[PDB]
Amino acid sequence: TSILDIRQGPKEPFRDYVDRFYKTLRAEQASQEVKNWMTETLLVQNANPDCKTILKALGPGATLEEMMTACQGV
């Protein structure tokens, strides 16, 4: 399965999705800079509308514990 095919379900907790992401990211062998680009970009983009909304409110500069606690009720 390709990294672009990794997406969050409509009922799937973000948490279970983030695990899937760094597992597939774990099978990507690209430069770190590209993998940083993938992190800030693709993760949020394939996140579900309800959490996506939430993550837009965190702004930039956000870290994984704060994202992970931010989308917990969703």
Partner: protein
């Protein structure tokens, strides 16, 4: 790890498969539970950075946590470099170089270099510095993964 031989010197010996597997099994069974930290600490007795990356790299599963830890290890390493600046002028022929955050993380150093620092007189405890970063990052995880 670097262990003391019968002759009375410190030499490197490899870590054992049922030690490796015991590390695996702990993680399988008790995941993020606090007992993992003393357990880690015992199984990390006399361990190198190189052996510590081996243990972290051999994890399967919990990849969100594994990434959070990595990023903590690099932050703690960035902080090592900040706090301890490089030293004045060229490196002496008679001496060996001071470590950076990445030598502590095992990344920029070789094994023989890791054995030089630890076995030499005074010795420098690059294991124990990485160990605190691991334990600190373990607290971060434990606190997050509390429900």
């Amino acid at each position: 790890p670097i262990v003391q031989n019968l002759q009375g010197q410190m030499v490197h010996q490899a870590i054992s498969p049922r030690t490796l597997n015991a590390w695996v099994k702990v993680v399988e069974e008790k995941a993020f539970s606090p007992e993992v930290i003393p357990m880690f600490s015992a199984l990390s007795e006399g361990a190198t950075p190189q052996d510590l990356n081996t243990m972290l790299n051999t994890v399967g599963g919990h990849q969100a946590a594994m990434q959070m830890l990595k990023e903590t290890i690099n932050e703690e390493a960035a902080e090592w470099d900040r706090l301890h600046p490089v030293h004045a002028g060229p490196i002496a022929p008679g001496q060996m170089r001071e470590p950076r955050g990445s030598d502590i993380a095992g990344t920029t150093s070789t094994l023989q270099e890791q054995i030089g620092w630890m076995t030499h007189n005074p010795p420098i405890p690059v294991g124990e510095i990485y160990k605190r970063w691991i334990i600190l990052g373990l607290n971060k995880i434990v606190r997050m993964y509390s429900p």
